[PDB]
A paper describes a structure:
Family S46 peptidases are serine proteases showing dipeptidyl peptidase activity and are widely distributed in Bacteroidetes and Proteobacteria, but are not found in mammals. The SmDPP7 enzyme forms a homodimer, with each subunit consisting of 697 residues (Ala23-Ala719) and a molecular weight of approximately 155 kDa. Each subunit contains a catalytic double β-barrel domain harbouring the Asp-His-Ser catalytic triad (top domain) and an α-helical domain that caps the active site (bottom domain). SmDPP7 hydrolyses peptides from the N-terminus of oligopeptides, cleaving the dipeptide units (NH2-P2-P1-COOH) when the second P1 residue is a hydrophobic amino acid.
For simplicity, the following description refers primarily to subunit A of the 1.86-Å-resolution structure of the Tyr-Tyr complex of SmDPP7. The bound dipeptide was found in the active site cleft of the catalytic domain and was covered by the α-helical domain. The aromatic ring of the bound Tyr(P1) has hydrophobic contacts with the side chains of Trp214 and Ile650. The hydroxy group of the bound Tyr(P1) points toward the bottom of the S1 subsite. The side chain of bound Tyr(P2) is accommodated in the S2 subsite and has aliphatic contacts with the side chains of His84, Lys206, and Phe671. The hydroxy group of Tyr(P2) forms hydrogen bonds to the carbonyl oxygens of Phe207 and Gly209, and the side chain of Arg218 via a water molecule. Thus, specific interaction between the S2 subsite and the side chain of Tyr(P2) is limited, whereas the main-chain atoms of Tyr(P2) are tightly fixed by the side chains of Asn213, Trp214, Asn328, and Asp672. In the Tyr-Tyr complex, one of the four water molecules at the bottom of the S2 subsite in the Val-Tyr complex is replaced by the hydroxy group of Tyr(P2) and the side chain of Lys206 is well ordered due to aliphatic contacts with the side chain of Tyr(P2). Although the structure of the Tyr-Tyr complex showed hydrogen bonds to the carbonyl oxygens of Phe207 and Gly209 and the side chain of Arg218 via a water molecule, the enthalpic ﻿contribution showed little difference as compared with Phe-Tyr binding. This suggested that these hydrogen bonds do not significantly contribute to Tyr(P2) binding.
Numbering used by the authors:
A (entry chain A), B (entry chain B): 23 to 719
């Protein structure tokens, strides 16, 4: 079924859910801290779920990837080898910034947020500051009890605001990863593709202090005891079976204006794909010369591959469905429908006029901003900017500090500085600086008008770039101890440094703060017009019998439908893959280099009691017509009885343009079957202690 | 069904044909000069069929591509625009070397063949010379009547010989080609692929003189009047329907020795694919710079692309079915079975030992022979060699002239010199000479032992090559009128020439003639051993209840089966594509740039009365489990009643490895539906004159 339904829309999907084959009362799903919805957790960018009373958490391999990478070295490469913790004390910290978010409460604060905004009258900076102060005050009250972290969400272009309260678990440990040739079988070749044969799962365990409250890693921390956990399905999942997903999809753009879509299609997606593909080649070459570079940059390479291939898919998808035509036609239809209301339609038409005027004056600056932005987000330079910014914010009262730099953010900033140790190699960072400066100096003179960067380059050729990278080469910010000393330092200490990366951050900061202020003014201008125009689009869609649900915004959503394939002329994709398909893709070379134990078990048809007689093999991956996007990876796929039949992990090639224009015919979720997860843990990369804890052995 | 069945095996397949749904009696197909088999003609490398009483011939667009290319210029490009001849007088010569072969007679000459070989005694060179003499004598006799071309065919390793006698139509004219965007929709991307959306058809007409006998092109030649021609099918072709194909498969290797397969898999295919891919990039680059190069090298590019991609497909298919294992297992099974047969086994066991002995004599020279062979077959150099060779053979009695250099071959030699005019640009031929010379000079010293080439290079680097290419640029042989003079010149004129290409030819010729004698020796050593060992394999296969049929050898074969798709894990390929499938592949960029009229027609569901209600559209291509290979392109696909339902044109990706090891599961023929052919000539690239001639309007 189309739609990323908020839990508050359960009454509107209760009937469809039952019709599709849900056997739980839709009432049971409305208890968000209950069984089974209370078992679903946010990771921040990924979804997961509790699968044992001792705080065992299951998610995708690609979601645990960052944690696996932090614990990997060139000599002991857990990305390649996998990992298993036979006992609690074998579990590895997933890193200081790893989180498990357990939902505690949702509060609607729409009326209070709208009053905060209205209070600022016609002043857009005051409007931005008023919402910022409201967000901060809601969060501060909601976080007064230790161990909770709150987040304010804006829905439907600012027509609804809800405050979420989570128990914020901060000691997350790696329990189990399959080898990378299972976790990521087919690599970047099969990414965004069906047929799919990827064992995309891994396990964490949540921990808390001995006092029961969230704590950073400590030896005497103990496993979290969740109120609710999911059970692996005992009923074999088949074609046509009801499935549902709860999770945390990040962002969709289905309510974007036509001009927002056209800028993304014509500029953002092709441009990022081009540059990312070039940076990836540079990282791959560096990784061949030094495995330490390969391991340190593996999480960056995986993320950039995934984005660059996604963007290529979206561009092909837009042609497949004529997204530009569809956007143009719907936008024209909304304006005509508003014009038909006369008086009552004028405010939405005015709001549209206002939004339309924001949609440009980027043609001259967008390449500069991309290149300078990327340069500034290289490791040493970005650490310097973050560290200098923090020293500025610390001089203010906490409530006046920039979101991201408040007291509640300090342990996250520090964690970032710590994680950089496992994700930084000076010689690779120098190549990244050189790449992005090269693109900058190639811009026409009118466009290379970053005064500070022009001062530091003193030239616009390869020699000028080499001289600046050579100068920044002298930074001490590669040192974790130096970064942690700068974390505590005052503004004057930064301003006195002869560290070249620090000096660069000090020089660029005034211009960064002004560009940030202009951003907040532009945001404040939209806080009025965006909700009006998006409410009119939603009212129009409702008049056309179209499904009305908010764009994804990182909050909890429910999607549902059934196990089913899809088709193109001459081809029907079947809803399941099987063990034999994994072996048929074997090449003996990454990324089609399955573990020997897998090839041996498939050749022997060692099905481990998990064969689905309807397929004649153990299923591997399955297709369904659910509506998921980035953020949904690791979401539990539940059957009619609320049991875990798999994890969401990807979409097929034709699904990715549904970020902008939903296509029910060719949009499918790709999930890993819970039977494949068990079969891997039985026959290939054994986790006998996990199978015991999951009640599967 | 498996098998490329010779017409003499019709008794064996009589029952299977009936089981599969043939409504004609098998005896009707036994009549080779009768209806429908007498409608089936050879083009020499492609199949075709008569489709009107006025010698209208239908074949694939890729079979007619050479003819279309010959009639194309950068200004008037018939590959791109397509072609239609509204009247007999608008039809264009397909070129001097275009032919239609109409089967006159087949006679078995096995006994005489084997006697001729036995009679030479034991000298390998004598056995070869004796078979050559018998071939020439049987051909000379059979071709004494003015309008006939005959060919001796060796089957099943020399266990059977048959002489084919053909009426040789020497005036073939192009009547109709659709635009290249229909004829070759999807180009090299969709080549060897299902799903397929390619309208791969074109029409010729066969002309004779007013006396009713074959003539070269003349303005007062008239259409041939065939005794039999196929009728387009009136029954709509559906999934599971019986289909059959008669045609002229070139070469299969299913009876190859395990070592012949291992050399092909390990060296021949990967090496040719690598170098052809490199040359194709060069021709693409040169064609982009020069529209005259693009058109002149179109047919060469098309052919090299087809081989390179075929070879990459074969290598993948060998890995899919473990071809290396199957060859090893069969060979070992034959030898073990022969050792159980007592006295009966000893001649075949001894034959095997003789064959095994004369395999690997190449690992040393194979790279050199490939690169020098390719260099020698560049246009100017290859013309120089052929022309000097003819001048040498002319001075011999006809009967002692090398096959291909005899009286009966003169017209074909002269045709090639003329056709070169439309397929040569000096700067492109220089880049081809440079490419292949560059591969030669890269070889280790020990392997670079071509005496003449080393002398002409005077070096072993890019500069040496550039020096020799500069030298050869001096040639006159780029001029058609110069080539045709040399065609009639005697040996002494060649040996007197200071034209650097003639001088190169004169210089290599002694070493070429020795290499050719060593070839005939190697063929002579094999002429008794090969039949003995291949008869044992065939006897062993019969013992195991496997299908026994000869490897393709350019002679007429029958294959049959049913319209059916195929599958692999997660995917089922359906047996038909449809019009909407063509439109869905549209990018407006070559090779997915359909004619505006096709897109308009599809968008408007102008099905021109050709809808199949079971598909809900007009079918485009279809799949069937027939057994075809190179040479079968243009073959008519006949339904249960012997009516034309389409043309064979391709195989799916997994089919190509069946050249070496047949796989019934994933081997399919790809055919263009007779209704798509009608639909294009009605709604897109109109041919109202042909639609009437075919009785479809
Ligand atoms: N494409 C995946 C990431 C991935 C990469 C390589 C693998 O072998 C496996 C997974 C991805 O981005 N998944 C998203 C979820 C998602 C996004 C869009 C659509 O259509 C479906 C799923 C994620 O949250 O990581
Ligand atoms: N691959 C085709 C040629 C072709 C190339 C590009 C197109 O768009 C269409 C056709 C080809 O080589 N066809 C063969 C016939 C054939 C060979 C092997 C198998 O397995 C099936 C058919 C030909 O005779 O030209």
């Amino acid at each position: 079924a189309e739609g990323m339904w908020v839990p508050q829309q359960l009454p509107e999907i209760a009937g469809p859910l039952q019709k599709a084959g849900l056997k739980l009362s839709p009432e049971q799903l409305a208890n968000l801290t209950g069984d089974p919805m209370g078992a679903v957790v946010a990771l921040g960018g990924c979804t997961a779920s509790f699968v044992s009373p001792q705080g065992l958490v299951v998610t995708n391999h690609h979601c645990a990837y960052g944690a696996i990478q932090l614990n990997s070295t060139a000599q002991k490469n857990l990305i390649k080898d996998g990992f298993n913790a036979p006992t609690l004390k074998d579990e590895l910290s997933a890193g200081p910034n790893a989180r498990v978010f357990v939902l505690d409460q949702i509060t609607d604060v729409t009326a209070q947020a709208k009053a905060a905004i209205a209070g600022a009258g016609n002043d857009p900076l005051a409007r931005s500051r008023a919402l910022d102060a409201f967000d901060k005050a809601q969060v501060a009250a909601c976080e007064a009890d230790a161990g909770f972290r709150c987040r304010l969400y804006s829905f439907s272009g600012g027509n609804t605001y809800r405050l979420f309260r989570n128990m914020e678990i901060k000691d997350v440990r790696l329990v189990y990863a399959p080898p990378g040739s299972v976790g990521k079988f087919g690599g970047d070749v099969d990414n965004w593709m069906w047929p799919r044969h990827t064992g995309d799962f891994s396990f964490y365990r949540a921990y808390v202090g001995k006092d029961g409250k969230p704590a950073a890693f400590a030896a005497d921390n103990v496993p979290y005891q969740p109120k609710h956990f999911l059970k692996f399905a005992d009923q074999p999942l088949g074609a046509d079976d009801f499935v549902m997903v709860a999770g945390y999809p990040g962002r969709t753009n289905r309510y974007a204006l036509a001009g927002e879509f056209n800028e993304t299609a014509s500029f953002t997606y092709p441009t990022i794909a081009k540059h990312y593909n070039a940076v990836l080649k540079m990282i791959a070459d560096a990784g061949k010369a030094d495995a330490d570079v390969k391991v340190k940059y593996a999480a960056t390479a995986a993320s950039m591959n995934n984005v660059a291939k996604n963007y290529l898919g979206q561009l092909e998808g837009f042609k497949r469905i004529d997204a530009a035509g569809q956007k143009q036609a719907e936008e024209a239809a909304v304006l005509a429908w508003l014009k038909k209301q006369g008086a009552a339609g004028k405010p939405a038409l005015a709001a549209h006029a206002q939004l339309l005027k924001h949609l440009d004056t980027s043609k001259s600056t967008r390449e500069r901003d991309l290149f300078v932005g990327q340069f500034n987000n290289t490791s040493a330079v970005g650490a310097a900017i973050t560290l200098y910014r923090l020293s500025i914010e610390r001089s203010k009262p906490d409530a006046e500090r920039e979101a991201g730099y408040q007291e509640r953010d300090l342990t996250t900033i520090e964690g970032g500085l710590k994680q950089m140790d496992r994700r930084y190699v000076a010689k690779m960072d120098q190549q990244l600086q050189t790449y992005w400066l090269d693109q900058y100096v190639a811009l026409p003179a009118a466009q290379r008008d970053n005064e500070v960067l022009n001062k530091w380059l003193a030239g616009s050729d390869a020699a000028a770039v080499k001289s600046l990278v050579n100068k920044l080469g002298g930074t001490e910010l590669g040192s974790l101890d130096t970064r942690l000393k700068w974390f505590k330092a005052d503004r004057a200490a930064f301003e006195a440094s002869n560290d070249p990366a620090i000096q660069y951050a000090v020089a660029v900061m005034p211009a960064l703060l002004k560009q940030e202020e202009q951003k907040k003014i532009r945001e404040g201008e939209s806080l009025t017009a965006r909700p009006l125009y998006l409410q009119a689009v939603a009212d129009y869609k409702k008049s056309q019998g179209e499904f009305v649900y908010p764009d994804a915004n990182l909050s909890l959503r429910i999607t549902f439908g059934n196990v089913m394939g899809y088709g193109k002329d001459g081809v029907k994709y079947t809803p399941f893959t099987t063990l034999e398909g994994v072996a048929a893709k074997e090449t003996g070379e990454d990324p089609f280099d399955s573990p020997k134990a897998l090839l041996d078990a498939v050749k022997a048809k060692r099905y481990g009691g998990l064969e689905d007689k309807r397929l004649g093999s153990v299923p591997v991956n399955f297709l369904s017509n659910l509506d998921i996007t980035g953020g949904n990876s690791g979401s539990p796929v539940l059957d009619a009885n609320g049991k875990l039949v798999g994890l969401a992990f990807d979409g097929n090639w034709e699904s990715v343009s549904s970020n902008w224009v939903f296509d029910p015919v060719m949009t499918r979720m790709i999930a890993v079957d819970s039977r494949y997860m068990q079969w891997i843990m039985q026959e290939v990369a054994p986790a006998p202690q996990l199978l015991k804890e999951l009640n599967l052995a």
